[PDB]
Each structure stands twice: as C-alpha cells, then as structure tokens.
C-alpha cells in the first residue's frame, strides 16, 4: 500500500493546500442551544456538517443531492467523520517563528543564522532590532541594534538603511541566506583552520546547511505565517453529566490566538502607534 513515511517542513502553500477554509472568529459555539458558530472555530462551510448527510440548518433530509450548499446554510454535505480529517488555517496577522526551531537545543535557527539564542529571543520579543542589508553604512548583517543604537542610526543613516525586528526581520534574514554560498565558505573555513573547538563548531553548522539544500526545505518555512488548526473531532467538545461543556485545552489556545489576531488586524487597520502594535504582535508571538 505504501512504503516510507516522509517528514519535511510545511510551506504556506502546503498549509493552504491542507486547508478547507480560514478560521476567523474565535467564537466556539452558541452555548445556549446546540448550534456552533458561523463562521468561528467550529464552522460549517470551512469544515463539514455535524449530522451525516444533512445540512445542519435545513435542506437535504434523504439520500439524493449530497453536496449542494445553499446560502442560508453555508454548510458542506458529507459523513460524520469527515470533520476529523479536515483541518483549518489561521491567517496570522504578524509573522511568528516556530518554537520547535527556535528552542530545541540546539536551536535550528540558532546555528543557521550564526546568532546566539539570547540575541535571537531579544529581537523576537520586540526587545531588540536586527539589521538586514543596510547598504553603505558601518554595520554588519548579523549584528543587532538597540533603541539607542537605532535612534542614533536613524538620524545618521536616514536613507538607504534597513533595521527591522521580530519574526519578520528574522524571516527576511533566513529568506535572504544563500545556502549554497555558505556551504563553500564553511567548507573552505573548515579546511583553512586548525582550531579544534572551531572545527567542531564549523562541522555542526555546515552539516545542517548542506542537509537543507539536499531536501526541499526552505529557510523561510521556519517562521509560521499560515498557522494550521487541528480538526474539531480531534479537539472534541463534549459535555459531562450536567448542563455545561467541559472544553479542551486546545480550544483555549486556538481561541486566544484568534482573539489576538483579530485585535492585531484591527490595530493595523486603525494605524495605532509603534509601541501598541509591538505589544500586540508580541502577545501574538507568545500566543
């Protein structure tokens, strides 16, 4: 039936190909009746109909037209286990780097961008700035920048100068990181040195640099742009004996990410100042 299981990174096109509809609203269910939310976490159109071969709201109560989707229902028409395989995707307003590739010991983004973990987190939690192809100035590419380092630079290099922060900046760095070029450099660096410690420090960096080129894994796939949501059936919402719903923990996590993402979209609509959207994107990153 099938040979080997292949694991790789998830591209945003791959996550949009898994998906069946963008999960917008964080509203779980109605909670006073029995119906869900249109269109919230537990949607109808994005996933499927609760009942088998039934529009949850009202049409098709026999076995003839399995598939029709009226405007009054905004519902698919398939099996009860169809929602268990279907997954949704949350359009994260602000880019958020993965925690599994930022804190794995050693971090995947720590030995790839030649930057210490401490400095990586600082910029990631809106506490430090990072340069990206500045131009004709006296600054490196990996070197970071602080409030005082940026303020002075802002008044100095007001023209051709780029110094972002957070996952966005990190993403750019990874995106603009010629893998092949680094290989030769690293390989030449390992053959032009005798330092024991350096040799081991260079062989561990070039090993993860050539392995990324051997596969179809991109450097910009580390940062999460199109967060995927697990199927409702796999995060079940059943009530215990009584009249309340004992809700799972993942519904709390997804509902907070969606609440924060809606807040961040509204603040980028309203053009809030810098410190507000830095706290907003930082709360989304931590969420």
């Amino acid at each position: 039936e099938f040979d080997a299981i292949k694991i790789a990174l998830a591209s945003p096109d791959m996550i949009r190909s898994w998906s069946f509809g963008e999960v917008k609203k964080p509203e779980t269910i109605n909670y006073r009746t029995f119906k869900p939310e249109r269109d919230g976490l537990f949607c109808a159109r994005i996933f499927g109909p609760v009942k088998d071969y039934e529009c949850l709201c009202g049409k098709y109560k026999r076995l003839k037209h399995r598939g029709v989707i009226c405007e009054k229902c905004g519902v698919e028409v398939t099996q009860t286990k169809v929602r268990r395989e279907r997954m949704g995707h949350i359009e994260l307003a602000s880019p958020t780097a993965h925690i599994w590739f930022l804190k794995s010991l050693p971090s995947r983004i720590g030995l790839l961008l030649d930057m210490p973990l401490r400095d990586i987190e600082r910029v990631l939690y809106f506490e430090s700035y990072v340069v990206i192809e500045g131009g004709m100035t006296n600054l490196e590419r990996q070197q970071i920048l602080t409030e005082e380092q940026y303020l002075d630079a802002l008044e100095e290099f007001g023209d051709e100068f780029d110094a972002k922060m957070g996952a966005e900046a990190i993403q750019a760095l990874l995106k603009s990181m010629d893998l092949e070029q680094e290989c030769e450099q690293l390989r030449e660096e390992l053959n032009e040195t005798n330092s024991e410690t350096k040799r081991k420090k260079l062989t561990k960096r070039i090993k993860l640099l050539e392995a990324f080129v051997q596969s179809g894994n991109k450097p910009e796939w580390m940062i999460l742009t199109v967060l995927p949501v697990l199927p409702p059936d796999l995060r079940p919402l059943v009530p215990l004996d009584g009249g309340r719903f004992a809700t799972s923990d993942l519904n709390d996590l997804y509902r907070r990410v969606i609440n924060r993402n809606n807040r961040l979209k509204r603040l980028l609509d309203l053009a809030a100042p810098d410190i507000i959207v830095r706290n907003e994107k930082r709360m989304l990153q931590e969420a």
Binding site: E147, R263, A271, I275, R278, N279
Partner: protein
C-alpha cells in the same frame, strides 16, 4: 512640558484603573506631574491601554506602577520607558474634530441604499431602496424576507441603517 505615555491595565477594569489613578495623584499630591488620563471611546479602542499625560521621574513611575491593577508601561525598556509621538497628533486632532460634523440627521433621510428594517410586526429585516419619495416622506422599500421582496407600504419609520 508633559509628554504622553501608555499604561497597561487588566483589560476590563480600565475605568476603575483611571479613577484609582486620579485618586492616587490627589493622594500623593504630585499634582504638577500629571495632566490628564485618557480612555478613548467610540459609539472602545484601545482595548486595555490607558493614556497618561505625565513627566518622567522615578517617583512618578513608582506612583503609576503602585496604582492597583496596573501591569506597567509599554516602551523600549523598563529603565526609561517610551513616549509615543507628536507628528501623528496633528492628523488625529483633525479626525477628532470631525467626530461631530455629521454622522447624525443628513439633511433629509438616507433611503435607496442597503438598510436594516426593525420596527413592530416587520422587524429584524433588510433590503435595498428602490422607491422612496422625499416630498411626502414615504419609503416603499422592498420587504426582502422570502425572496419575493415587494416594497410594502412603509416610511422613514422602520428605516434602520443596515
């Protein structure tokens, strides 16, 4: 000169944080070190942030963080926290002055476009305007409910805004 700063409160207790902040000012009588306290509101941005006209001494910083149900300032660092701007205050002032120039009784009414009907029997509905006289103030807007939306006899009476 007093510059602005952003305070984070427990979101939901924001008016009580503003009242307790004014009261802590008038307790510890640093009256010359505080100008205002803003929580703006639309018919509520910002969702959990309190704007304070202030100056920066470490005494006033400890005062604002000793106000209860206040997490802290939001800035570049916690040593010298950050004021916001001033060039975006001129454009925000013109937008705040146009908050009561209209958006009420536009001369006559506002039929013809999409609107939400909700009054007496024919309530909680909608439909676009296709017939409405301003000489007799009569609006026979379609009663869209079961597809066939024949504009029933009505007027700027049930005319909502949906």
């Amino acid at each position: 000169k007093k510059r602005w700063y952003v305070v984070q409160a427990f979101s939901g207790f924001e008016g009580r944080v503003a009242t307790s902040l004014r009261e802590h000012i008038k307790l510890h009588n640093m009256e010359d070190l505080f100008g205002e306290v803003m929580v703006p509101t639309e018919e509520k941005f910002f969702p959990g942030y309190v704007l304070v006209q202030m100056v920066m001494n470490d005494a006033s910083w400890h005062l604002v963080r000793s106000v209860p149900r206040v997490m802290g300032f939001i800035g570049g660092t916690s040593d010298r926290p950050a004021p916001i701007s001033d060039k975006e205050v001129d454009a925000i002032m013109n937008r705040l002055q146009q908050v009561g120039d209209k958006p009420r009784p536009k001369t006559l009414f506002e039929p013809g476009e999409m609107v939400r009907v909700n009054d007496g029997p024919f309530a909680d509905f909608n439909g676009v305007v296709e017939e409405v006289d301003y000489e007799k103030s009569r609006l026979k807007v379609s009663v869209s409910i079961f597809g066939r939306a024949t504009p029933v006899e009505l007027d700027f009476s049930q005319v909502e805004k949906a």
